Amino acid sequence: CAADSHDMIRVHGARENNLKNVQVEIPKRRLTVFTGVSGSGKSSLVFDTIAAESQRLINETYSARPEVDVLDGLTTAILVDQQPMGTSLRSTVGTATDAGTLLRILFSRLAKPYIGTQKAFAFNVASGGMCLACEGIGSCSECHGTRLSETARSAKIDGLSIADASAMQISDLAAWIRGLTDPSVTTLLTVLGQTLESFVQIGLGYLSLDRSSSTLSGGEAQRVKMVRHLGSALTDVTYVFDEPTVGLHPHDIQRMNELLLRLRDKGNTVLVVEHKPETIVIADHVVDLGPLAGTKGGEVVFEGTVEGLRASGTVTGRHLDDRASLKPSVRQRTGVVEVRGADAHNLRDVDVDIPLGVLTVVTGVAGSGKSSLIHGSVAGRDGVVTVDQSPIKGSRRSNPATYTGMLEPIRKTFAKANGVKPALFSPNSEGACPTCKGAGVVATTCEDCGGKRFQPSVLQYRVGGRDISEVFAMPVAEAAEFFRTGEARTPAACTVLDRLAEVGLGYLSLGQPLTTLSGGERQRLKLAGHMGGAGSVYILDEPTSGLHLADVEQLLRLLDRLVDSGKTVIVVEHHQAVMAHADWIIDLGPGAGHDGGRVVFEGTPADLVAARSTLTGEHLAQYVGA
Amino acid sequence: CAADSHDMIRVHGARENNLKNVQVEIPKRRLTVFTGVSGSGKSSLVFDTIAAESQRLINETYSAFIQLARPEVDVLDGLTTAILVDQQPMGLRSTVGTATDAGTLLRILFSRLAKPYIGTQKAFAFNVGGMCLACEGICSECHGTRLSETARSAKIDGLSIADASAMQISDLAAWIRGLTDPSVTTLLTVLGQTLESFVQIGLGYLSLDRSSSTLSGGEAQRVKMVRHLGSALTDVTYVFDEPTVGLHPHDIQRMNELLLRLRDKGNTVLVVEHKPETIVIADHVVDLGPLAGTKGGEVVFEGTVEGLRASGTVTGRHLDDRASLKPSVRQRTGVVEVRGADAHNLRDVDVDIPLGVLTVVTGVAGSGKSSLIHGSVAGRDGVVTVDQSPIKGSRRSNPATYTGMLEPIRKTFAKANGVKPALFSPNSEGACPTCKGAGVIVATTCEDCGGKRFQPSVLQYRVGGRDISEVFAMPVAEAAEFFRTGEARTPAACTVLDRLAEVGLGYLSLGQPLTTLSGGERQRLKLAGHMGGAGSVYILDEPTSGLHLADVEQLLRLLDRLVDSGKTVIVVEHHQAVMAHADWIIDLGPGAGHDGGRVVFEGTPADLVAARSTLTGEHLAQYVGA
Ligand SMILES: Nc1ncnc2c1ncn2[C@@H]1O[C@H](COP(=O)(O)OP(=O)(O)O)[C@@H](O)[C@H]1O
Ligand SMILES: Nc1ncnc2c1ncn2[C@@H]1O[C@H](COP(=O)(O)OP(=O)(O)O)[C@@H](O)[C@H]1O
Ligand SMILES: Nc1ncnc2c1ncn2[C@@H]1O[C@H](COP(=O)(O)OP(=O)(O)O)[C@@H](O)[C@H]1O
Ligand SMILES: Nc1ncnc2c1ncn2[C@@H]1O[C@H](COP(=O)(O)OP(=O)(O)O)[C@@H](O)[C@H]1O
Ligand SMILES: [Cl-]
Ligand SMILES: [Cl-]
Ligand SMILES: [Cl-]
Ligand SMILES: [Cl-]
Ligand SMILES: [Cl-]
Ligand SMILES: [Mg+2]
Ligand SMILES: [Mg+2]
Ligand SMILES: [Zn+2]
Ligand SMILES: [Zn+2]
Ligand SMILES: [Zn+2]
Ligand SMILES: [Zn+2]
């Protein structure tokens, strides 16, 4: 029967970015994992081709296009990514979720005194719960950060205003809800109870509803969205995940896995981009991109089962069982950073010494307090370079060449060779495309210049047989060679280019818009940009995100060179390869939220592993084969 | 296999509007036809419940920046993405070319192939590209084409894009097929295919430059269907409202084949229909009834088509109804003389339309029926046009308001309570501050008043035991009696109420927002308003739209009373029961567009059937068993 015959998503002739005219056959209503080194093409295929085309086909039906030849059997795509859900100064976990609305309804139906409908409990409307002084923003002495008017806070259920309810952990909110007895609101209590418990089940019990949406990690944002999908009655949709193990402790990966398979078993296609073998191995189907990155990847080098992947001899197949060992010895501290009475968030008046001149890895379950400790007590101090995953400013107008400073010497080399002025090859050129400069105008290729960025007057000027648009289109790795010798020789470009290669970004194009970078990409770009000296204490939050096990060895060499040239490196991680490479571990716990906030271990990795006393130590001991 | 098990859309506890806690099980990837008399509840179930809930679940996944209340239903399981293929407009600067892929692809073809070169695809667009600066793309400079001189200078084989856009799609497809240039082999195939699909669906007579706002509901629906038939989306629920609208008897089978084509792509197809020739292709039937309004709202049959035939429901009993020709016809009392009619495709038509009788104007879509009637008759004295078009300010109106009865009712409420009429009006200070109409912004129930319309002190004032809120909630058929005798008696309301009953609108509520009326219902509403008044000739464009075969019998009694009281009734129709009942038929043809525009028959239905010499006659002959 024809109507029941469309059980595969079929791709033919896919060419977005580096993809080499690839083809795949993805089984609908199954979990497919997309593997391969970073820059191999995984997001080009899953996000910029499959999901982008589903989204365009949906968009074209509303009243109000990727490069690929055939895309057959597509369904609606919902992106469950690591982008924030709303970023306004008025978006919280509660405003982004059914929870917050249900809670406002409960309060309009049960709090005393009566004050109105659900909207009297909301800070994103006035006349309305909004505090009039801060306009529901909260930065504010009149509402003490709660965002609500005195009236909105006066209406209470058993002693609790909605501000109190929103301030507690969701695990505590859930218990508060379960203890409410009142026959008027029974179904509402059941419905709110079940959403809250679902937060608890995915492991977000430590968050509060009042948490500002922009302070969530990429992984927390993604998991908050997942609560909605897991509760949704939609079926036959394609849910698309970007590394859903990000921000999860080793103890918590199996729980994420079961969530992904539960989504599938609801009758949905689940597409996951992952590097972690513990998630790869749950797949019904595998698509492996490679062989390597950029112009050296973009091919489907394996497609089949997980057992087929193991036997395939691809770069992913060959590393799938790679598991680090501990160092034979650790470095000796050249000093101490004294942390005294750390009490941000859940931290239980923490005293700890962090060793200088070594690689310290800060570990513990999500919500345990790692970032609260490190950001709160170390980040503000002098000489301390925080390199994180946050967006870069003016990203629409910038690219890796501009952000790092290499573009200027390149423009000088073009100008000197061709008898013209530097500025002719800039965003403010006479010859710049009127409608972009960036070659794109969310981001699609600018039609006026075709992506070339400049009018043909500027493009006639060449160095090494290449115009300036061809240069912007080069990967860092190719540019590293292009600018090394001959007419184009440009030593100050070479300097930055080698650093970008060394942090693992050899695949990025010099002109790639910065808004297309992942958080781990942004962080490695910044890392490269700070390399060259300036300060002596580097803080890196989860620098392995987006890295295949091949790539992590290279980051670990880079961190070793950093420490050995006399710097302190402090890394917050769940990646056990990084843990295994540490000189010193500080483990937070025991659990998340008020079950955590304490240093449960401080010591060498070998002592951690010998004890097996903490969740981190237990997992790490299994990981190193102990 | 749990993932493959969600193969039914399951509705339990549906209570929107008149629905009586209904339940159905709709098979995915099958065609389900929803049948029943007008007002039985079909659209309540299909559009306000099934499709609305799919759309809500999709919308809640969109970011807050991007951005619908749950219908009244208990469980709605197995839902997929839903796309409405309704008779709503697509409009302006909006043409069939701008609304379709065809237009975009045409512009691209011209940018690649046309000489002289003038630019990229947007140099050929009239949304500053190709736009005529004098009229701003809307004219002595561009002669109505909307395009600058430069835009029109660019030629392929002598034709500009204005010429290609002015032609019928059917001639454009042949032209496109005639072009041979290796540069664009692939675009000619893609363009030629989308154009062929316009031809196949029967819209070959349209031109790409036809303004979107001037399409009929049927044409608009078929333009949308071209896009769906070409879409690679699968596992979508496509929801159609009466897709036989505006189709000639000859063209029904082709629309059936396209609906089944859409299913066979791997999609659920939901269709609301009254035409037996389409009903009988269904995989599954859901029949609403027994009758309309409070007498409906139940699922009175669900199952197979053969089941429907045996069922004894109203639908089942009428499935095989074929009207017969009248044994005699009325004699004209005069003639409307049409001379030289040359609107659109009309070939200088001379025709006499008889006065004092029921004339039915027939012929294939695009033959020129509306060009003739609208261009040559609708101008004249004592001619009332009663069409399906939207009514002014419908957002703030309802049947009670539109017909003038709401003010007499407020006076009745005022006198009987020693208050004044304005307390009960939209400009009252007791009216809900954010509505009056009991919904906001499409149409959702208002939170402030909870759908009540007025504060609870206004609803203290009653007549016949009913507050004003309850009066707005009443069906016409109940209002008619409640206002006929007793302490709420209001004669002026009864007069209007009875008129509404007689045009088949007994099920409408008095406060029903006018934006919820279908095209047919608006037409019949306007007809009730005109029936008192002064005209002697009435023009009705497709008044069977939205009518079950049971409701069409009651329409024909009404039309017979209209004519028998001395009025001329001219009806444009494809419904063969109406043609069989006529005094006189004017048939346009032979075909559509430049193959149409001539009167190919004029005479009694009997003489049409005996000649059996046009498409309409051949079909009417088969319809009456000749
Ligand atoms: N939006 C884009 N514009 C230009 N080049 C891009 C863009 N996105 C990715 N690339 C490049 O395409 C290649 C593959 O990238 P991606 O598919 O992001 O890899 P992965 O997801 O496997 O890390 C890389 O060389 C990358 O720099
Ligand atoms: N901006 C914030 N506002 C309020 N509470 C926060 C904020 N950031 C973190 N928390 C809370 O502090 C506790 C520790 O979280 P965090 O330091 O982010 O843990 P980790 O970094 O180990 O995952 C958690 O219970 C978390 O919900
Ligand atoms: N949006 C609405 N608000 C109030 N009443 C409505 C609305 N839509 C339909 N109705 C009423 O509900 C009943 C069911 O109508 P509907 O589902 O439109 O019937 P059908 O689609 O079978 O013609 C009718 O009595 C109608 O007047
Ligand atoms: N507004 C318009 N602008 C240009 N052409 C039109 C317009 N309305 C109709 N036509 C053309 O006139 C011809 C007859 O159309 P129409 O009168 O609407 O036929 P019918 O009413 O029989 O379906 C068709 O080829 C159609 O494309
Ligand atoms: Cl940190
Ligand atoms: Cl620069
Ligand atoms: Cl038939
Ligand atoms: Cl009957
Ligand atoms: Cl009053
Ligand atoms: Mg990417
Ligand atoms: Mg309706
Ligand atoms: Zn405030
Ligand atoms: Zn440009
Ligand atoms: Zn003009
Ligand atoms: Zn209101």
Residue numbers in the entry:
A (entry chain B): 15 to 78, 89 to 151, 173 to 184, 296 to 597, 608 to 792
B (entry chain A): 15 to 81, 87 to 110, 113 to 148, 172 to 182, 296 to 598, 608 to 792
Task: Recite the paper's sentences.
Echinomycin is a natural product DNA bisintercalator antibiotic. The structure of Ecm16 closely resembles that of UvrA, the DNA damage sensor component of the prokaryotic nucleotide excision repair system, but Ecm16 lacks the UvrB-binding domain and its associated zinc-binding module found in UvrA.
Our final model consists of the Ecm16 homodimer, four ADP, two Mg2+, four Zn2+, and 612 water molecules. Some residues, including 183-293 of chain A and 185-295 of chain B that includes the entire insertion domain, were not modelled due to missing electron density. The dimer interface of Ecm16 buries ~ 3900 Å2 of surface area and is comprised of residues from the ATP-binding I, signature I, and signature II domains. This ~ 10 nm long and ~ 2 nm wide groove can potentially accommodate a ~ 32 bp B-form DNA and provides a structural basis for the previously reported DNA-binding activity of Ecm1614. Electron density at both the proximal and distal nucleotide-binding sites showed the presence of ADP. Mg2+ ions are observed only at the two proximal nucleotide-binding sites, and not at the distal sites, even though Ecm16 was crystallized in the presence of 10 mM MgCl2.
